[PDB]
Structure formats: C-alpha cells, structure tokens
Curated annotation (Swiss-Prot), chain A:
To B.subtilis AbrB and Abh. One of its GO terms (biological process) is sporulation resulting in formation of a cellular spore. Disulfide bonds: none annotated. This is Stage V sporulation protein T. The lineage of its organism: Bacteria, Bacillati, Bacillota, Bacilli, Bacillales.
Curated annotation (Swiss-Prot), chain B:
One of its GO terms (molecular function) is identical protein binding. InterPro entries: B_subtilis_Trans_State_Reg, GAF-like_dom_sf, SpoVT, SpoVT-AbrB_dom, SpoVT-AbrB_sf. Disruption phenotype: Deletion of the gene leads to aberrantly formed spores. Mutant spores release their dipicolinic acid (DPA) via germinant receptor (GR)-dependent germination more rapidly than wild-type spores. Spores are also more sensitive to UV radiation and outgrow slowly. Induction: Expression is regulated by the sporulation transcription factor sigma G. To B.subtilis AbrB and Abh. NCBIfam families: lp_hng_hel_AbrB, spore_V_T. This is Stage V sporulation protein T. The gene is spoVT. It comes from the Bacteria. The lineage of its organism: Bacteria, Bacillati, Bacillota, Bacilli, Bacillales. SMART domains: SpoVT_AbrB. The N-terminal domain binds DNA non-specifically and the C-terminal GAF-like domain is crucial to its correct folding and function. The non-specific DNA-binding activity of the N-terminal domain is modulated by the C-terminal domain, which perhaps in combination with another unknown factor, confers activity and specificity. Gene3D superfamilies: 2.10.260.10, 3.30.450.40. Homotetramer. Two monomers dimerize via their N-terminal swapped-hairpin domains. These dimers further associate into tetramers through helical interactions between their C-terminal GAF-like domains. It comes from Bacillus subtilis (strain 168).
Length: 175, 173
C-alpha cells in the first residue's frame, strides 16, 4: 500500500505517480501489459518484448558466438536476457549500464575498437579491448540491444555488421 | 494481454474493456500499490469491504432455508430484507431495541414476544424473533434479525443468526 490515490480522467487515463515510475524505471513510451485480477484489481507490469522473446535471444547469442567467438550480450530495456561467450553469472539478469541506455536511446549502432574501461553492467567497470552495440529498435522504439565485445581483440565491420543484422532481425520479430 | 504505453506525464490509459468490467467511470479514484514482483496494482478506492456486500444474498439464503422474515441492519438502517416486504423495512431506521441489543453485543432469542419494535417507533405484532449482533473487532456494526408473526424461534434460528453474525463480522476484518 503506497496509499496514493489518483483519479481516472476523461479518456480512461490514470497517472502513475513519479515515485512508482522510478522505483520501477518506467520511462515515457514504455509499454505496460494490463491484467484484471480475480479480486477485480487492475494490474500493470512492464512489458518486455525482447525478454519474453526468451530464446530467440539465447539461440541468437549462441550462434553469434559460434560464428565470431566473441562474448555476446542481449538486453531488453533493463537487464541482460542472454549471454554467450562470457559467463552467465556475470551478466544474466543484471542491470545494464548507463552507456547501454544512452546508446539505445541514441538508436544508432556503435563500434568502439579502442578506448578501454567500459561498463556493461551498472556500476561495474570492465577491461575491454573493443565492443560494438546494435540497439534493437522496433516501431521506432528501442526495446533492447545486442552487444558483442572482446577483452583482447578488436571489433571491425564484421562484428559491427553482425550486431546490425542481429538488432534488425530481432526488431522485426517484435512487430 | 493488452499493452499500453505510458505517456509524458506518467499517464497510462486503462482500456475501455477493463473500465467497463470494473465500472470505472471518469473521475473515479483509484488506489495504487506496488507488489513483490514489481507490479502496480490499481483498485477502486473506498476501500475494501462493507456490510451489504453479502447481506442481500445472506438474508435470501436464510429465508430459503428457514422461511422466516430476515432483516440485516448496519448501525442505522435495514440494508437487506427477505421474507417480509422490502418497502416495509429497507432503508428504514432501526428501533431502539435494536440499538441496545447491538450495544449489548450479545445475541438474543425472544420466543415469547407479543410485540416488538423493529423500526423506530413502529410497534409490531410478533410471535418471536432472534437477533445476532454483528461485532467486528469488538465493535457492533450491525445486526441480523430473524422474526415470525406466527411461529416460535428456537435453537435452529438462534444458531442461524449467530452463524450469520459471525460470518458477516469476519468479512469486516
């Protein structure tokens, strides 16, 4: 019980208090799934396309790894939902870094082949040779990202194109 | 499986389907909760349960079962009537006898009445009646009344008001 009361407006819009939207990191545009509970409740929960995608991500990340041999992360808007190459305990279900959020917002794919000391997981700085990120934008809306990285090899067009292909394929799925 | 986006201003639209199956009208106040799983919960704010969610159905059952007249009151009026006529009792002010019986907190059985006021100021012919005060959290919040203008009440009906008062009480806790 937050015991916050709001009225529903003409148009059936209720405002979710900013407190809530922060403790749940719901940003403008975020999709929420609605349920009615037995008790008659209305239920709102973040809707993560990319995450209930469940195993596209896993299978995709696995293939990228078999093919390129680099570490591969796929995230929704909040956590990493698939990990290959690197260790799952390190990344799976962990909060993405701020760099990831902005890259996703920036909507454009990136390739850093130099400049080490990056954060993939919120608050953890990591040794890194190079990485590339392909934001997964479905319906103009960033809903996740694909990350390929290497702690001792340089990324090039090969891996850069690969995240673009992955992001594009995955995006299409969510449409 | 209906998805809606939250807008600038943190407003999500509750689909019209929902707003109908829950009869939420423009302006209605909704209480917000956050849950374990990080779900937001909205519920029509009053909140929670109140005597009368049940009274009708309960009084009806008591009548189908025992065939006597059944009244249920809150602290002021009769909120459910079965057996007898609704026009006679529904929304009418309880008698002083009812108020004191409720205060007295204890259930009563008058199997040898000749009269009784159920409604404030109206004396009524009565064979017998039994009253079960509805005490929730040690506090009388209503009563269940079974009465008969020509039959005697016994353990059957006496137990019945006790069961009804106890069940209804629990609801309000």
């Amino acid at each position: 019980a937050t015991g916050i009361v709001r009225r529903i407006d003409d148009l059936g819009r209720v405002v979710i208090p900013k407190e809530i939207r922060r403790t749940l990191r719901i940003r403008e545009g975020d999709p929420l799934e609605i349920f009615v509970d037995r008790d008659g409740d209305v239920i709102l929960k973040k809707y993560s396309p990319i995450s209930e995608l469940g195993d596209f991500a896993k299978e995709y990340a696995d293939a990228l790894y078999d093919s390129l041999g680099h570490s591969v992360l796929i995230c929704d808007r909040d956590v990493y939902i698939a990990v290959s190459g690197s260790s799952k305990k390190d990344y799976l279900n962990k909060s993405i870094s701020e760099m990831l959020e902005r890259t996703m917002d920036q909507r454009s794919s990136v390739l850093e082949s130099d400049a080490k000391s990056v954060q993939l997981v919120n608050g953890i700085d990591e040794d890194m040779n190079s990485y590339t990120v392909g934001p997964i934008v479905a319906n103009g809306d960033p809903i996740g990202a694909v990350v390929i990285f290497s702690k001792d090899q340089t990324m090039g067009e090969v891996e850069h194109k690969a995240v673009e292909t992955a992001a594009g394929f995955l995006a299409r799925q969510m449409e």
